[PDB]
Design a protein around this ligand. Structure first.
Ligand code: V8O
Ligand code: V8O
Ligand code: V8O
Ligand code: V8O
Ligand code: ZN
Ligand code: ZN
Ligand code: ZN
Ligand code: ZN
Lengths: 251, 251, 251, 251
């Protein structure tokens, strides 16, 4: 499977033809303020340099494999463990986030994918209610260089080839995310690539992360994908809510 | 019986000349708003990949057989089980929906046919009020490839020949339907082919679903009907309301 | 089965414990105006004097059996034939209507019971959507002797014994009903006695029918029922709407 | 294990000492209104008289086994099938509900236990978030005999001895529940008996159901439990929220 071309995703994974897919257009007006949504809590995201982490160009994204012991709570009794994070991006002067807000697409997007602690294996969690959870943040152009992101972006040249990997020092994974953990949207959806399993809890931060224009250009211009092709515009088309209500943790 | 030339349908089925037939032209300004029309309830429609579903070219449409367990309600205690779905379509740049809206014919139309749970058999329900209910949705052209419809459309080549059939993976049947289950038109009418039985409750979604130009081309151009003849323009002409008022679930 | 005492009605017929029973309390402010509800049409209700009709004290009510050829339509394509009518009433100083309006119980009530023309036999219509329709009107005191009701009431003395019957000349049955057929409530419920079968379309007139004080006393004070007891208070307690929305033909 | 005596529940079943147990005390003023909570959908619950259903004294409660095809939804795509229902009650002069509201215990409580359709088997669903869902309604004292409850309460004398069982006619299960399906409290908790598995979505109806005092007495006073003693006060003490915020579908 690939972005742009065939095979059609429902041929690859039936679940990709579900009614409750991701990503979606967040319309803050139509969102339901729910005071029960408490601030997100992360434990163990401040990683030391060793052991090193695998960073891979899988031909679809750049993926950082995360070690054991990164814990995340969506609220009391809703506990998760981090597995991996990765990015979706555009091209030169073309934004490439997955989620939109009132039709606006942002330059890029970070996903941190988590497994519910009630499940030992991802294959048992797929398609089950609350089995996986993804934390998402928009990346926008800012004036300053983001130095947390520079640790990853400076390594992209080594994995320009599709299907290539390198090892990188551990870092503060939470410094790749916004500092406001109390203001977010939350909805139930799917993985935005095959196998497109539903039951996934998406938390989209309201605060954005700022990268420099150079950093954004490094992300979008360095990696190669299937064919003689650049790895760009690696985002799925917006998917209808189909009656789902996005909640918001703030009025 | 066939679409196109003879026989005239009142000769095969005299019920086709009844006073209360389908389809009809929907004129939203003349529809009667009733707040008693609640959102449609469709449960059990998210099918697993196995078992597989029979898909058949019957000469008149492409038809997907639905298993037990797809429950639908039009109101409190007014419950239904889905039997089958099928489609009506046009030809190259000629629309072939059955219902029209203020004279406008849409590219195509999906029908999900149901049996009242008050009747153990279809043949007891034929001609009895509310024995059969059909959910109808309009298919329009949009920019994106539609995932739910691709699962069906990619299999038509396998069944191009009149009378041929195949077996397809389970899919979310509800994904084939518009976003807002609270917005529809409703009236009583007939089956749109022989035997033209009356007492059918038609529910026509207000919102459409979108397929790509190529998807709509695949639908109209792949299947063959009776004779050495294409399966196309498989819609009945618009019938008079004869005093019936179409209702609306929305002001 | 009897009013007042045992056996409990669900043991006689399990449908008497359905969620969607009659009668109900009509709260006109919670009723949904639907302009699809047109004036009721009756045809054949003006009977010649011969053949005579049977008027029976069945222990629960006084019931008039109607002949063939009385036709009623709730709207275009919604056609019914009248089977019988009967009354429900209270006792001296106590109202006995079945339906209530904003908690007000009226002196008495008339029910005219019909079978959908889609069905040859009552037993096939029971529990089926729209299979049976009842027209209901409240009876109140006015200043004049009602001459249509007098033809029935003047014979009650003859059928005072439980299980007794008499022959009465045909009359204008529609003169037992209000002259305003355009203003009414309509909802879906049940028979108000065993078998308590659901799917029954109830139409309750806004306008009442007027009987003299003496006529109302004849109704409540002449007939005898099970035991050595008066046939009085022959109404079921108000049943909860349980989420059903009563419609009104007027704003 | 049993109600009243030894052993203490965390010895039989250490999950009973988990941090997120049920039942809880609902303080409506501290509940979080979330407008994403939509009306409950229950299809299939109107059962015919045959086949019959197993009703069983199990020493801890009276339990009705429900057949396949009772479908229930908490939200879009979030579907369940009903397994069984059972009751919790007090004794002569003392209430026996499990949940309390602002400290108030109600005479009794009904639980309808469901399995997520994302899981083929109950044993897969235990301890998994959303795996099981219970619908709970309080039973209060009212003036009238309840028709729906009488079908069960009248059959209790035939199963009075611990471990005995009977077959009952099919009944409308929805008729045992409150009128307004849009108004409920919801939180995540546990089974209220061993094995005390967590992950259970509890939905507690705002509105009560009403039973005659005779009916409540039949419930509390007819059944025999463990030892040679009565089956009564079969409720668990209220448990701490430990940070859980209870949600309400209504302001
Ligand atoms: C968790 C997972 C997510 C994904 C994703 C696809 C798309 C996303 S995104 N764009 O965040 O929704 S996440 C793919 N495969 C796996 C996966 C699938 C199967 C086994 C796995 N074992 C360990 C780690 C990951 C495994
Ligand atoms: C359910 C049914 C729908 C249809 C349809 C004809 C036309 C439509 S459409 N365009 O939805 O109105 S649906 C035709 N025949 C049957 C049918 C008719 C008679 C007996 C049957 N027995 C088993 C299954 C189907 C039976
Ligand atoms: C139609 C019918 C109504 C009723 C009742 C009718 C109406 C009520 S009331 N209070 O109007 O709802 S109870 C009882 N039995 C039958 C009935 C049941 C079965 C066969 C019948 N054949 C002829 C006429 C009536 C038959
Ligand atoms: C579904 C189920 C609920 C319960 C319940 C215990 C307590 C409740 S209550 N008070 O609703 O919370 S429900 C007990 N056993 C089963 C059950 C039923 C069937 C198979 C099972 N296998 C393993 C464990 C439990 C099984
Ligand atoms: Zn992603
Ligand atoms: Zn059709
Ligand atoms: Zn009656
Ligand atoms: Zn319980």
């Amino acid at each position: 499977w690939r972005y742009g071309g065939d095979p059609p995703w429902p041929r690859v994974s039936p679940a990709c033809a579900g009614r409750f897919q991701s990503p979606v257009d967040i319309r803050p007006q139509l969102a339901a303020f729910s005071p029960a949504l408490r601030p997100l809590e992360l434990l163990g995201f401040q990683l030391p340099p060793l052991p090193e982490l695998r960073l891979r160009n899988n031909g679809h994204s750049v993926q950082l494999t995360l070690p054991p012991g990164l814990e995340m709570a969506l609220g009391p009794g809703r506990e998760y463990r981090a597995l991996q994070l990765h990015l979706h991006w555009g091209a030169a002067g073309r934004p490439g986030s997955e989620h939109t807000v009132e039709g606006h697409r942002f330059p890029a997007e970070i996903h941190v994918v988590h497994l519910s602690t009630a499940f030992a294996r991802v294959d048992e969690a797929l398609g089950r209610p609350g089995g996986l959870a993804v934390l998402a943040a928009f990346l926008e152009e800012g004036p300053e260089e983001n130095s947390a992101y520079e640790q990853l972006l400076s390594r992209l040249e080594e994995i320009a080839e599709e299907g290539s990997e390198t090892q990188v020092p551990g870092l503060d994974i939470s410094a790749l995310l916004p500092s406001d953990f109390s203001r977010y949207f939350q909805y139930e959806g799917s993985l935005t690539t095959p196998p497109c399993a539903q039951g996934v809890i998406w938390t989209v931060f309201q605060q954005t992360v700022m990268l420099s224009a150079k950093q954004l250009h490094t992300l979008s211009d360095t990696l190669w994908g299937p064919g003689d092709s650049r790895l760009q515009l690696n985002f799925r088309a917006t998917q209808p809510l189909n009656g789902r209500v996005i909640e918001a943790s703030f009025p």
